[PDB]
């Protein structure tokens, strides 16, 4: 099997800057017939892959002029003139000259964008889930940048750190921001004893914390 | 273009047959190749078949573990995997590279454990918490096996102001969430619903997010 190795592993770019992805094969990809069977594919997460360039430099229909395929023999390069919001995802170099076809490890591309503060939203457990024995208090932290952030859950003043389940979404392809969900799963008995529930979020955009809460009593 | 079968919780030791069906075109004129993607690693080429004469080739790692066949009649290609184990729990795609046709993917979980359907809970906001002229609502889909789940707002009508968070596994059961921010005017006037389809157990669930009252 022929090894395809690409660099870098990740790549940050300010919307507008160029970018380059390199790929190196353990063997030449020039077939005896004069053809180099190498391609570059893109994949934005949880979607079917898409081919950008094939045969090293030919571009597929409906692929912007800014995607250039270069290289020969064992070294090939993928170049993006100006990087845009929609370019976020993973890129791979794929060889089909030797059998079996092998794909490189892929390269994830991220975008450096201006900083943003998350718009917070807290949610009390649906009664529908209450009458089943449990209680999920969810908090949504949306459209913010950079990725790094943290969330504390405070019940009646005291901080809790278990039951918590967090999820981050990939960098949005429209505004390059993020979002994150944080839910605190507890029993209904535990839930009904306590009144005040809080969701504290601290983000680079401010040292002072974004505080969203609700008092299970008046609603 | 290319429709593929749904997710399948099949048990260890078993076999499985995946179908890929072409519509807009005729699969004779193309080579149908299948690629594996263990959603951690990259793509792994499995093999390919020339449906016109059912002529195929398989990667060394798949000889004897994969079988490719085609049905020129119903415009369908198949990839039958045998002796499934934990190494096969992946997402397989069928593809016709010539003109770049892909199928949405078929998730496959090899596990002994049984299928569980998710419980969908609408998330409507506390006492009119009003952040401006917008309203943010959610849908908590939890307790299901296996992946994936397919969530949409109003069968897809709500194509913006949506955030569908990756599912996190916990105690051998997944959990997922989604949000939707809209203008203060629409909801509650115009109703909102999140459809959750757990194809692994032929389950479709629509939840009308209604304004809470005495609770």
């Amino acid at each position: 099997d022929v090894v395809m190795t690409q660099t870098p592993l990740s790549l940050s770019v300010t919307i507008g800057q160029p970018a380059s992805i390199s790929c190196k094969s353990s063997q030449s990809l020039l077939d005896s017939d004069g053809k180099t069977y190498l391609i570059w594919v893109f994949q934005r997460p949880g979607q079917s892959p898409k081919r950008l360039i094939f045969l090293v430099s030919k571009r597929d229909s409906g692929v912007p002029d800014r995607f250039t395929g270069s290289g020969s023999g064992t070294d090939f390069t993928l170049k993006i003139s100006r990087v845009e919001a929609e370019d976020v995802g993973v890129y791979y170099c794929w060889q089909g000259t030797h059998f079996p076809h092998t794909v490189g490890g892929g390269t994830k591309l991220e975008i450096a964008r201006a900083d943003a503060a998350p718009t917070v939203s807290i949610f009390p457990p649906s009664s529908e889930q209450l009458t089943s024995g449990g209680a999920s208090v969810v908090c949504f932290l949306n459209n913010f940048y950079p990725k790094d952030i943290n969330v504390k859950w405070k019940i009646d003043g005291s901080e809790r750190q278990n039951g918590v389940l967090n999820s981050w979404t990939d960098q949005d392809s429209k505004d390059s921001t993020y979002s994150m969900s944080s839910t605190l799963t507890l029993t209904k008995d535990e839930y009904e004893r306590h009144n005040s529930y809080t969701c504290e979020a601290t983000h680079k955009t401010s040292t002072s914390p974004i505080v969203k809460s609700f008092n299970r009593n008046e609603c | 273009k290319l429709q593929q079968s749904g997710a399948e919780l099949v048990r260890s030791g078993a076999s499985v047959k995946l179908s890929c069906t072409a519509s807009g075109f005729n699969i004779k004129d193309y080579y149908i190749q299948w690629v594996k993607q263990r959603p951690e690693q990259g793509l792994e080429w499995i093999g390919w078949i020339d449906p016109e004469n059912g002529n195929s080739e398989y990667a060394p790692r798949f000889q004897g573990k994969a079988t490719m066949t085609a049905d020129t009649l119903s415009n369908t290609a198949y990839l039958q995997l045998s002796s499934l184990t934990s190494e096969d729990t992946a997402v397989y795609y069928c593809n016709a590279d010539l003109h770049d046709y892909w199928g949405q993917g078929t998730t496959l979980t090899v596990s002994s454990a049984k299928t569980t359907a998710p419980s969908v809970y609408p998330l409507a906001p506390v006492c009119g918490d009003t952040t401006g002229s917008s309203v943010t609502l959610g849908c908590l889909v939890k307790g299901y096996f296996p992946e994936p789940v397919t969530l949409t707002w109003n069968s897809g009508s709500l194509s913006s102001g949506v955030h569908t968070f990756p599912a996190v596994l916990q105690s051998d059961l997944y959990t997922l969430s989604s949000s939707v921010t809209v203008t203060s005017s629409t909801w509650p006037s115009q109703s909102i619903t999140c459809n959750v389809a757990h194809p692994a157990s032929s389950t479709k669930v629509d939840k009308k997010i209604e304004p809470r009252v005495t609770s």
Binding site: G96, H101 | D29, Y31, D50, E57, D97, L98
Partner: peptide, 10 residues
């Protein structure tokens, strides 16, 4: 054929 953009079947 041509049925692919990669190397054809032998």
């Amino acid at each position: 054929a041509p049925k692919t953009n990669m190397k054809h079947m032998a």
